Design a protein around this ligand. Structure first.
Ligand SMILES: Nc1nc2c(ncn2[C@H]2C[C@H](O)[C@@H](COP(=O)(O)OP(=O)(O)OP(=O)(O)O)O2)c(=O)[nH]1
Ligand SMILES: Nc1nc2c(ncn2[C@H]2C[C@H](O)[C@@H](COP(=O)(O)OP(=O)(O)OP(=O)(O)O)O2)c(=O)[nH]1
Ligand SMILES: Nc1nc2c(ncn2[C@H]2C[C@H](O)[C@@H](COP(=O)(O)OP(=O)(O)OP(=O)(O)O)O2)c(=O)[nH]1
Ligand SMILES: Nc1nc2c(ncn2[C@H]2C[C@H](O)[C@@H](COP(=O)(O)OP(=O)(O)OP(=O)(O)O)O2)c(=O)[nH]1
Lengths: 481, 481, 481, 481
C-alpha cells in the first residue's frame, strides 16, 4: 500500500499515509459523511452542506502540518515519524464521537433525553476510536508502520479527551509535551481543529475568515516553559491571536448561534425526544437500542447519523406521528417564532439547573398592556448561550507563551495592557433568546410584552427592538431611558 | 409577507420574492436537501457535499439576474415583473425531478430497472412541480402576486422540458422568445443552470472555474434573429464562449466522469437493483411503491432521496443482505478495480443496444499471454461515456448569435475559422472504461491482458499505460508502435 | 458616446457613464496611476503595487452602488440620475489631491516642509477637481448629461471636503442629506471609500477582509433622524459595524503602521526635504515650484507623483547628493533600525508640537548600564501613531442610526451595552516607535538601553521584548515586575 | 543573519534564505519594483499594477518548492541544499534583464531602435546578475553558505539563458539534468515562471486561473529518459497539462495581447524612439547612454525603468516635445483607433522582414466604396501576433515524459490521440490587428473599407464585424458568404 492524495477545497492536495487510509476506510469513520458539521445551520445557510468527514480529514492534515513544521525548524525536538502519524491519527479521529446534527446531539438532545449521564463528543470519539481499531484489525497495521499500539493508542486517546485518569500523560513524556497542544489544546484552545472549521465553515457559509493559521505555523517554535517543552508564538503575533478568538466569537454570533438555526436544532431535538421510544437501532448481538441509548453500544452508534431525521420524516407508523409532524412543520417553515434577545447585566450568570424554570418565569411576567391571548409556560422556549474565548471568563492569551527575535529559545508572557487598550475587558457573556410556539399575530404581540417585561423585572439588557415591539413597557425602566 | 435574503457561498446575498419563498418551503422542494449534486463524486472529492437544493436556489438567482439585466439595458423588450418571477420559478424548479444521487438515478438506475420507460429528470421536474403547486395551494398565491396560473404554469413547464406538444410555445409569444434561452437553452446549451454548477461544483470540488458568467451577462443583449427576439453575445466574447464549453468538458473529465466516482455510482446502482424488490415507499392512498416505481407517483417520489442508501446500509432484513453487502464493500473501499480506458477511432460510435454485449467481448478476447485465472463476462464492467459540447457532434457556437459595437441591434454569426485554428476540430467523442469485479493481483493482471487485447482487436486507442500493464500485447499492434 | 466597462479584480465588471469616462481621461485623473495607495507599504508588502487610480474607480463604483440601491428600495426618496452621477463623480474624484506616496505626503512631508500651512488631501482633491473641470472643458459635458454645473460642482466639492465656505450645505437640501453620508461620512466614518480600500488593500497585501459591504448595502435604508433623511442600518447589523472598525484597526496595526513601512516613509520624507531646494516643477505660465510649493499651483501639482522619488534616486547633480544617498540606502536595505514600541499609560496623550523634543528626551535618559557608544538626539527617530475608530476617543456606533424589521421607517439608537460586553472599552490609543540611525551592533545595544530607560522614566508600557533587550533596566520598574 | 518571511498575496508566507535576502537587497534587484509586469496592460486592466519584483520573488519561491518536493519524494536524487539555493537564485534572478514596460522594451522598442543587435531579457538577466554579484560582493556570501561561485554562478546563468557555449551544461552533470527543467524549461516550456505569472497576473487582472501547479508538484517525479534524469508527470495529469497551455493562450487573447494594451505599448514605444536622441542615462565612469544604449552598460541599465515614461511626460525641453505629446495623447485617451483583426488562412505565415510593408499594402487596397478621405501608409499600424503553445507549431505534450502508478520509475510518452479528439489540431496561429492614426469619423470609416478590402485581397479570415463595418465589401468574397 502507498500514500493517497485527496483534493480538499480548503487545503488543496492532502497526502494520506497508508495507515491513515486504513483507519479512514472503515464504517466507523465513513459514518461522519452522514453528519452535518453545523446541523440546523444548513437550514439557514444553504452553503453549509459540509459533513464531519471532510472536517476530520482537514484536522488530520493540519495536525500533520504543524508537527512537521516544528520538526523541520527544530530538529533538536527529535519528533519521529511515529509521533507525526500519532498526531495525524488523533487529528483525523477527534470528531468520531459526533452524533446526528453534531452539537445538537451532545449539546441539546442527550442532556434532555439522559440527564443522569455525562456525555461529550470527546468521550464518544475515544469509544468509537477503540471500536474502529478493534473491529477492523488496525493494531497489526499500526505495528507494520512502526507504531507501539499500547503506548500510541493511549497517546491518541489522550490528545482527544486529555488525561485518561506532576505529568498526568502516559502516551508521551514531558519532553514531547508540545505534541498535546496540537489537536485539542486544553491549555489555551489554540488548536488545528479550530483552524480547519474556521476556514471550512467560512468557505461553505459565505462568511470570510480573518485568521491566518499558515502564518501562525511559520512563526511557531517550541521553548522550555516551567520544565515543559511547549509551542510558543512570536511576540509580534499576539494581535493575530486576539483576532483568532475575535473570529471564533464572530462565527458563533453570525452562524453557530443564529437564532433560527438554534430554533431548528431545538425543534429537531423535540422530534427526536418524541421518536425515541419507537426508533430501534440494532447493536452488538442483535440487541436493540434507542436514539438516546445507541451511545451505550458503539456498534449501534456507528449506525446513528442524520438519517434518523429522514427515517422519522418519511415514516408512516402512527407511533411516530407527533415526531413526524414537527419535522414536517420545519419543511413548511412553520417555526417557533423568535421573540427577542437579552443579556444578564454585570456578573449575573444563569445556571444549567435553572434553564427549565425560565419559560415559566416569562409566562409569569405581568406587562401592564391589554392582551388578547394569555400565554402559558409551555408556549415559550428560552435558549441560554454561553459566549466566551474558550476558557470561561479567563483571557486565553494569558495562557500563551511567546518568544522574541533576539532570543528565539526564551519563552515570555505578554499582558493585555502591553498589547492594546481597544481589546475586550471581559471574555465571557450570556445571550438569552426567547421564542413562542404560538405563531399567531396576537400571540406574538403578547409574547413580546411578556418578554420585555421579564427583561425589565430581571434587570436584563434592553432588547435592541424594545421601543418598537413593546413601546408601552420600555418607558417604565429608567436604565433603558 | 416580504422578501427574504439568503447568504450563498457562490452568489453572496440572494433576495427571494415571497412567492419564491412559498414554493421553496414545501416538502417537494426541501427534498432536494437530501440529494447530492454529484452523487458518487462525494466519495472521491470530499468537498462535494453539496445538494441539489442550494444548486436550485443559485439557478433561480442567476435566472433572475439575466432577465433583470436584459430588462434594464433594453426597456423596449417590455420584460414584466410577472416575466421575471416566472423565469425565477423555472430556474428554482428545474432540478425538482432529480432522484437519489442525481445523474446516477436517471443515468444508470432507471434505464436498467425500467428499460421500457423513457424517464428524464426534466420530465420528473415538471411532474414534481405540478405536485408541489397542487399539494400546497400555490395557484392562489401566484394570482396574489399578479401571475396568471394557466399561462404561467405552462410557461414555467416549457422553460424546464421544452414544448409540451411555427412557434411551438404556448406560455409566451415570439416577442418573448429570449426568455426561453435563460433556464434551459435547447438551442445552444448556454443557460444559467450550467453557470451555477460550474461555480458551485468548482467551489466544493477544489477545482478552479475558468468561466465568467457575470461578464457574459454584462455583454448580453436581445436582437432580432429570423423574426424572433433572441439573446445575443458581444462578438469579442466568442473566445470566452468556446472556453465555457472547454470548462464544461474539463469538469466532466476531472470530476463528473472520474473513473472511481463512476464505479461507486455503478456499485450503488447495483445495490439499488438488488434492494428494489424489498424497499417499500408509501405513496398516494397509502399504496406501496418500489425505488423503481416511485417515479409513477409524485407523493412516493417526494420521499425518495439519498436516504435509501442508508436505509439499505443500516438494514437487518435478510432479503436486503446482498444489497447491504455491496454498500458495506464501498465503505471498506473494496471497489471493482479500474483496468483502463480506451477510445473508438475515427467515426466509430457504440450505441446503447450493444452496451450489455461489451463485457462478454472483453472476456472473449484471446491475449497471447499465459494466464493464472480465466475471467468470465460477469467479472467485467464496461462503462461507455459520451463526451461532447452539449449538442452531440455539432459546434454550439454555430448556434449562437452575436452583435458588434458599431451596430448593437444587428445580429451576426461567427464561424470557427473567424475565431482560432487552435480550437477543436471535433465536438464529440466516447471514453470506454473497463473494470474487474475480481480484485486479487492474479485476476487484475489477467483483466489487463484481456482489456488491451480487446482494444487491439477492435482498433481502439492504445491505453496510456498499455506498455506497462500489457508489455507482451502492445507490440503486436503496429499502429501503437 | 456610450458607457464603458472596466474589469476590476475587487468589484468585477464596473459600468462607467460617458461623463465619468470624460473626467477619468484627463492628465489630472490619470496622474493617480503614478501614486502608490500605501506608499512605503510596498517596500514591506510586495503585493501592494496598487495605485490611487484603481482605488478611485472603486470608490466611484461603490458610491454608485449605494445610491442606486437606496433609490431602488425607496423610490419615495426621489433620487435622480443627476444625483447618482454627482455621487459617482465625488466618489471618483475624492482621491485627486493625494501627493507622492499618498499619506506620507500630507501626513509627514508637508507638515515638516510647510508647518505654517494647513493642507489636507481633501482640500487638494477639491483644488485638483476644479483644475480638471476648467482645464478640460467638462462643464459643457456636465450640462449635456443633465447636470447643473454651479449647484452640482458645489455638491461634488461638499461631498469631498464638507461644507464649502442650520443646514450648512448648498449643493443639495435637507431632504437629500443622506447623499452626503456615501462618499466621505463626517458623522461616523462609514463610507464607500473605506469599503473599497478594505477589499483592495487586503487583495494586494495578502490579508483577508472580513467586512461585507455588499450585505451592509442590502440592509441600508433612509429614515428621518432629527428632521434629516439619513442612511440607517438594520439593528441586527450592529455587530458587523463594530467589526468594520475592528477590521480598519487590524489593517492599520498589520500594514498601514507597519514599523518598517513607517521608517521607509520617514526616510523618503527626509530625502524629499533635502531635495526640496533643488527639484524644480514647472507650473502655470512656466513658473517654477518646489516639491513643497507644487500644492500652490494645480498645474505643477498635476506633475508631482512618486516619479520624484526616481528623479532623486537617478540624479547626478551634486546638490542632490544627500537626498540621493538616503534613497540609495533604502535600496541596500540598511535602514534606520527599529529599537522598540511603547504606549502612554491611561489617558496620557503626546502633543504634535512636542514630537521634535522626543528624540532629545530618549538621548537624555541615563540607563544604569555600561555603554560602549554614547548616542545623541540626532541619532534617534520617535514616531507617534494615533490609533482610533476614526472619531478620536468617541464610539462611532453612538453616531449610527438603526431600524428594526417591525418598523423599517423608524430610526433608533443602539448603545454599547445592548450589543456585547466583549467590545472595546476605549476607542483611541497612541503607539510610540523608536528607531536608531546608527545601525552597528554596539549602537543598537545602547539605543535599546536609552529606549527602555526612557519608557521607565515616563511610566510608558513595558516593551514586549523589554526583558530580552534590556535585562538590567526592566527590574528597576516594579509595575513591570 | 537568519531567514526572512515575506507575505505574498499569491503564495502566502514565503521563507527567504539569508543569501537570497542579500541578493534581493541590491539596487540591481530592487529596480524591478519600477517595471510593470504587463506594461501597457495596466492602462486597460487597472488591477495590473504589479511589478517584475514581486513576480521574481514568486518564481524564486516556486523554484524552491519544486526542487524541495522532488528531493523529499526521491532522496536517491541526492539534491543538496546548495542545489536548492542555486535553483532559488536562478528563479529569483531570471527577470533581472527586463526593461521599461517589460515585453514592450525587448519585444517592440529594442528591435526598432537597434535592429542590428540581438537582445533578449534572458541575456539581460545574465548581464544584470553578473553586475549584481560583482557590484555588491555576493561571491564571499555565496561561499559562506556553502556555494562554489565559479560552478554555481555558471549553473545559475545556464538555468536562465541555457548553455553558455553531448551534455552541453557545465554548472551541473547529466545526473542533475532535471534541475534545468525548473526555472526556464527550454524542452517543453513547463516551468515555475509560467506558474507564478498565471496565478499573479490573474489575481491582478480579475481573470480566474484554471491551472493547479500545486497538484502538478505533488505528481512530479524524476525518471531516466535517454540516459538523463528528467522531471516526469503522472500519466493521468496529461489533461491538466493540455489545460495549462490552454490557460496560457486564454491569458494572451484576453489580456497580454489586448488590442488597446498593444496599441498603448506601440504608442509608448514610438514616444521612446522620438525621445531616444535626447534622454541621457549616466553609466559607469560617468559616461552617458541613451534609452537604446543603456543595455550596453549594466550600471546605466540599473537606472532604466518605467520612470523614463514620466521623465518624458513631465519634461519641458523643446527637443522632447514630439515624444511628450504622444504620452499626453495617451493620458487624454486619444489613442490610434482599432480598425479590426484578421488571420491568415491555412499555413500562411507573415515574416518579420515583411512587417513594415503591411501598412503600405492596406493603404494600397482599392475598396469599391466612395471615400471622403484618402489614407496613406503612415496613417496605418499593422500589429502581427504569433499565438502558440510556446514551441511554434509543435505540441509541447509530445516533449513531456510521464509515469504510470504501476511503474513509477518508468518514463513513457503519451500521444494526442491517446488523450482526446477534442484537443487542438494546430498549436500555432497569427493574429493581425490594424489601427488608424486618423481618429475622426470619416477617416475611421475609410480605414475600415481599406482593411476589409485588404483582408479579401489577401484571402485572410472575414473580420467578426465585417458585415457591419464594411457591408459593401463583404459580399464580393463568396468564401465569406
Ligand atoms: N483538480 C483535480 N483533482 C482531481 C483530478 N482527478 C482526481 N482528482 C482528485 C480527486 C481525489 O481527491 C483525488 C483522486 O485520486 P488521485 O488523483 O490523487 O490519485 P490516487 O492514485 O490517489 O487515486 P486514483 O486511483 O487516481 O483514484 O484527486 C483532476 O483531474 N483534477
Ligand atoms: N455574510 C454574512 N451573512 C450573514 C450575516 N448574518 C446573517 N447572515 C446570513 C444568514 C442568512 O442566510 C442571511 C440573513 O438571514 P437572517 O440572519 O436575517 O435570518 P432570518 O431571515 O431568519 O431573520 P429575520 O427574518 O431578520 O428575523 O444572511 C452576517 O453578519 N454576514
Ligand atoms: N475577463 C476578461 N476581461 C477582458 C477581456 N477583454 C477585455 N477585458 C477587460 C478590459 C477592460 O478593463 C474590461 C472591458 O473593456 P473592453 O475592452 O471590453 O471595452 P468595451 O466593452 O467598451 O469594448 P471595445 O474595447 O470598445 O470593443 O475588461 C476578456 O476577454 N476577458
Ligand atoms: N498575513 C500577515 N502578513 C503580515 C502581517 N504583518 C506583517 N505581514 C507581512 C510583512 C512581511 O512581508 C511579512 C512578515 O514580516 P514581519 O511582519 O515579520 O516584519 P519584520 O521581518 O520586519 O519583523 P521582525 O524584524 O521579525 O520584527 O508578512 C500580518 O499581521 N499578517
Amino acid at each position: 500500500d502507498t500514500m493517497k492524495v485527496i483534493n480538499d477545497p480548503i487545503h488543496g492536495h492532502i497526502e494520506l499515509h497508508p495507515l491513515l487510509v486504513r483507519i479512514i476506510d472503515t464504517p466507523q469513520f465513513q459514518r461522519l459523511r452522514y453528519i452535518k458539521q453545523l446541523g440546523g445551520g444548513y437550514y439557514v445557510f444553504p452553503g453549509a452542506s459540509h459533513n464531519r468527514f471532510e472536517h476530520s480529514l482537514g484536522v488530520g492534515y493540519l495536525a500533520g502540518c504543524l508537527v512537521h513544521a516544528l520538526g523541520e525548524k527544530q530538529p533538536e525536538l527529535q519528533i519521529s515519524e511515529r509521533d507525526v502519524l500519532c498526531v495525524q491519527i488523533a487529528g483525523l479521529c477527534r470528531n468520531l464521537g459526533h452524533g446526528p446534527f453534531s452539537h445538537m446531539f451532545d449539546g441539546r438532545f442527550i442532556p434532555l433525553a439522559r440527564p443522569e449521564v455525562k456525555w461529550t463528543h470527546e468521550q464518544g470519539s475515544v469509544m468509537m476510536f477503540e471500536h474502529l481499531i478493534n473491529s477492523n484489525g488496525i493494531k497489526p497495521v499500526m505495528e507494520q508502520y512502526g507504531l507501539i499500539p499500547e503506548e500510541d493508542i493511549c497517546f491518541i486517546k489522550e490528545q482527544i479527551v486529555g488525561p485518561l485518569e506532576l505529568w498526568p500523560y502516559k502516551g508521551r513524556p514531558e519532553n514531547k509535551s508540545f505534541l498535546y497542544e496540537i489537536v485539542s489544546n486544553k491549555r489555551n484552545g489554540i488548536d488545528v481543529d479550530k483552524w480547519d472549521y474556521f476556514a471550512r465553515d467560512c468557505h461553505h457559509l459565505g462568511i470570510q475568515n480573518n485568521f491566518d493559521y499558515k502564518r501562525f505555523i511559520k512563526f511557531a517554535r517550541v521553548c522550555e516553559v516551567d520544565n515543559e517543552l511547549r509551542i510558543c508564538a512570536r511576540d509580534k503575533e499576539v494581535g493575530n491571536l486576539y483576532d483568532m478568538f475575535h473570529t471564533h466569537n464572530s462565527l458563533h454570533r453570525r452562524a453557530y448561534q443564529h437564532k433560527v438555526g438554534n430554533i431548528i436544532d431545538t425543534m429537531i431535538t423535540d422530534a427526536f425526544l418524541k421518536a425515541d421510544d419507537y426508533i430501534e437501532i440494532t447493536g452488538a448481538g442483535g440487541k436493540k437500542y434507542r436514539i438516546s441509548t445507541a451511545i451505550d453500544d458503539m456498534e449501534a452508534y456507528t449506525k446513528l447519523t442524520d438519517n434518523i431525521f429522514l427515517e422519522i420524516l418519511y415514516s408512516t407508523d402512527p407511533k411516530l406521528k407527533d415526531a413526524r409532524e414537527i419535522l414536517k412543520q420545519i419543511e413548511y417553515r412553520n417555526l417557533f417564532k423568535y421573540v427577542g434577545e437579552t443579556q444578564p447585566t454585570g456578573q449575573i450568570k444563569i445556571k444549567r439547573e435553572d434553564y427549565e424554570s425560565l419559560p415559566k418565569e416569562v409566562a409569569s411576567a405581568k406587562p401592564k398592556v391589554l392582551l388578547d391571548v394569555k400565554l402559558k409556560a409551555e408556549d415559550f422556549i428560552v435558549d441560554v448561550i454561553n459566549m466566551d474565548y474558550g476558557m470561561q471568563e479567563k483571557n486565553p492569551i494569558d495562557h500563551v507563551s511567546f518568544y522574541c527575535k533576539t532570543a528565539p529559545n526564551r519563552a515570555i508572557r505578554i499582558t493585555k495592557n502591553q498589547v492594546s487598550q481597544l481589546l475586550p475587558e471581559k471574555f465571557a457573556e450570556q445571550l438569552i433568546r426567547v421564542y413562542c410556539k404560538k405563531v399567531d399575530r396576537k400571540s406574538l404581540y403578547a409574547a413580546r410584552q411578556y418578554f420585555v417585561q421579564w427583561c425589565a423585572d430581571r434587570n436584563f439588557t434592553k432588547p435592541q427592538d424594545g421601543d418598537v415591539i413593546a413601546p408601552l413597557i420600555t418607558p417604565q425602566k429608567k436604565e433603558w431611558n
